[PDB]
Amino acid sequence: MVESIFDALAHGRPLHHGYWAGGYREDAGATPWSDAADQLTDLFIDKAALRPGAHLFDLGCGNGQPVVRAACASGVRVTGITVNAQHLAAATRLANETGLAGSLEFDLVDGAQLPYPDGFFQAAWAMQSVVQIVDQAAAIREVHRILEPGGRFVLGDIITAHTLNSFTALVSEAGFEILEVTDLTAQTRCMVSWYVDELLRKLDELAGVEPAAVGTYQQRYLGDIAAKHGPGPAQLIAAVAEYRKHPDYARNEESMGFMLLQARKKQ
Numbered sequence: 263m264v265e266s267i268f269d270a271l272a273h274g275r276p277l278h279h280g281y282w283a284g285g286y287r288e289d290a291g292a293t294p295w296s297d298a299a300d301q302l303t304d305l306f307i308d309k310a311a312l313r314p315g316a317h318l319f320d321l322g323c324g325n326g327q328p329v330v331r332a333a334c335a336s337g338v339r340v341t342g343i344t345v346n347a348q349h350l351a352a353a354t355r356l357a358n359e360t361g362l363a364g365s366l367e368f369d370l371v372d373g374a375q376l377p378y379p380d381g382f383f384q385a386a387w388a389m390q391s392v393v394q395i396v397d398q399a400a401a402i403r404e405v406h407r408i409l410e411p412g413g414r415f416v417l418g419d420i421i422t423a424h425t426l427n428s429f430t431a432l433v434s435e436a437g438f439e440i441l442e443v444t445d446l447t448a449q450t451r452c453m454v455s456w457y458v459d460e461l462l463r464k465l466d467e468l469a470g471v472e473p474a475a476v477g478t479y480q481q482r483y484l485g486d487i488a489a490k491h492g493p494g495p496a497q498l499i500a501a502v503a504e505y506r507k508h509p510d511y512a513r514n515e516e517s518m519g520f521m522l523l524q525a526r527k528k529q
C-alpha cells in the first residue's frame with residue numbers, strides 16, 4: 263500500500279480546508295487545522311440537512327471522516343461515493359469501526375452518472391470534490407436529479423480552475439436555486455499551508471531569540487510530525503517550508519481561495 267502523500271499526512275482526519283470562523287490570521291493559530299476542518303464539516307451540516315433520519319448524498323466522500331461526523335451529530339443516513347479505491351476503503355472501514363455500518367454506505371462510483379433514483383436524497387454535499395471531477399456539468403445535473411424537491415445542496419471548493427462567478431453559473435445552469443454564495447478565503451486554510459505556517463511561526467519567534475537555534479528547532483518540529491504521521495509528511499512539509507523561504511513565491515499565496523455555495527432544488 264502506497265498513499266498519496268497528502269492522504270498520508272491527513273492521516274485519517276479530513277481532506278478539506280480548515281475553517282476558522284472570523285479569520286485565520288485573526289485566530290493566530292489558537293485553533294488548529296485538525297479542528298478547523300471539523301468546523302468546516304459542521305458548517306456543511308448546519309447549512310444542508312439539519313434533519314435526523316434524513317438521507318444525505320455525499321459527492322466527494324474521501325476519507326469518510328466528515329460523513330461520519332455528520333451521521334453522528336445530526337443522526338443522518340449517508341451514501342457517499344468516490345473513484346479513489348483507497349478512499350472507499352478508509353471510509354467503509356471507518357464506518358464499520360463506529361457501529362455506523364448500517365446507516366451509511368459507500369460505493370465507488372463515477373459521479374457523472376449516478377445509479378440512484380430520482381428525488382431520493384434530502385440533501386447533497388460536495389466538499390472539495392468538484393474541482394477534480396472532469397465532467398462537472400454532468401456531475402451536477404445528476405446531483406440535481408438526485409435530490410427531493412426542496413432538498414438543499416451544499417458545495418465548496420477551491421477558486422482563483424473556476425471562480426465564484428463561474429461556479430454559480432455551473433450550478434444554476436443545472437437547474438438549482440442558488441440562495442447563498444461566499445468567499446471564505448479569509449477564514450480557511452489548506453492542511454499543508456497550516457503545518458508550514460505553524461513551523462515558520464514558531465521558527466520566527468525562536469529566531470528573534472536565538473537564530474543559531476533555528477535549524478535545530480526546524481529539524482525537531484519536522485521530527486515530531488514524522489513521529490505522528492510518518493516520514494513522508496515530514497519530508498513534504500520540509501520541502502514546502504524550503505519554498506516559502508523564497509519570495510518569488512510571495513504573492514502566489516492568496517491567488518487561490520475557497521468558496522461555499524448553498525443551493526436548493528425548487529418545490
Ligand SMILES: Nc1ncnc2c1ncn2[C@@H]1O[C@H](CSCC[C@H](N)C(=O)O)[C@@H](O)[C@H]1O
Nearest residue numbers: 277278322323324344345346372373389391
Ligand atoms: N468523478 C468523480 N466522482 C466521484 N468522486 C470523485 C470524482 N472525482 C474525484 N472524486 C473524489 O472526490 C474526493 C475529493 S477529496 C474530498 C474528500 C471529502 N469531501 C472530505 O472532506 O474528506 C476523492 O475521494 C475523489 O476520489
